DNA sequence: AGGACCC
DNA sequence: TGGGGTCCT
């Protein structure tokens, strides 16, 4: 019961869409801007020294001949995600998402009935496609290796694929679980694949230099782990499971834990639709208030369009905010209720328009002057 | 309703 | 002053 998951990963991807539309940009140095932050760039930006969520600033001081196009508006880019995700759902319909860019494929019932379709005598005519982490050798007796191979070859085709189709460059990483996988798509960029043969697990866990690298260790347990002297991956193999547990619970603790030994058992989930479509917008103390009225407008008008063609029905809305100062209380507050009936299903607008202001006004003391940076609503809870 | 994580 | 997502408590 060995997998092979394969984990695919698009190159500087809001760019490579800007790129497409418009190949007046193809080789200029570009960058894709939202406010006053460079979100990505592509390739040859990267030479120049620009970096994600650099200041706009900033950027044209390390490229002044830097173009930037505005991608606060994500449409073109979330519709090539999902033309991505149902490419690869044609090879197995079992496509896991994480965010716009990475897909997850679990190919084990196709590296079998491949398997199955070939004799003796040309399993050893059965070679990799891209790299090899580490340059570790294959033995062509083994049966997972050979397994790994196919699954190279599968996401081969894949790559292959979604350049003919669609018109992207992209890295695919083929290992043994979903951590590893994801892990090893980034060894060789741009374009480029590598697979993970077992032999060679603990050189890739090992690689790494700060434990936050781990998928699935974050800002807040990142920085809880430093302040117990935990650094290294070594440093959390061998620290002591109570202790840990003690600090993180025995959830939090046990599943980093086994991450730490490449370990992880999660199985490849079907995304399928979304479960959640938000809008959101974001400015430097730039509402109080009435304006807010306006702003909460232009997202339902958006979002309204978005939730008629995916024609499912949202039965829940929520009303995201935040408030002014500074490095301090930077957490946010929401409000939800569930969308009256008569609702679910022109004029949509202003019913909901007053639910989001009922919802706004709960939260804001709308006497003493408000401090908001930022507007967002979520439509969710569908069928 | 908030909090963790991911891109 | 990114602009989205997922699932858990
Ligand atoms: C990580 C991250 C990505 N993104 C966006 C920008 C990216 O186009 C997309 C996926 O990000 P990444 O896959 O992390 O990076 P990238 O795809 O832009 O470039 P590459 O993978 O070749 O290094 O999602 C954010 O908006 N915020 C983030 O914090
Ligand atoms: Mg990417
Ligand atoms: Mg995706
Ligand atoms: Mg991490
Ligand atoms: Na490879």
Redesign the pocket.
Known sequence: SSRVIVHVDLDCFYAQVEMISNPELKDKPLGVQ????V?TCNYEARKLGVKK?MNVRDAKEKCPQLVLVNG???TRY?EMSYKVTELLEEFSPVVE??????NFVDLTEMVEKRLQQLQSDELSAVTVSGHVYNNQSINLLDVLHIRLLVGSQIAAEMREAMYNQLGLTGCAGVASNKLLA?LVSGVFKPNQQTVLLPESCQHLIHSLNHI?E?????????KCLEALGINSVRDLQTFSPKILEKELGI?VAQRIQKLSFGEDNSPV?L?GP???????????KCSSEVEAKNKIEE?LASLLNRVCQDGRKPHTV?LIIRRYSSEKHY???????PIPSHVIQYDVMTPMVDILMKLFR?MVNVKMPFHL??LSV?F?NLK
């Open positions: 939202q406010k006053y932050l979100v969520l606060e508006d994500l979330r998402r994480l965010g716009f860019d990475e994801k936050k781990i998928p699935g260790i974050g800002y807040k347990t990142a959830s989930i995304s979304p479960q959640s479509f938000s809008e959101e917008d974001s400015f430097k997202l929520r957490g946010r507050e929401s409000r939800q209720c709960n940076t930022l979520c969710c």
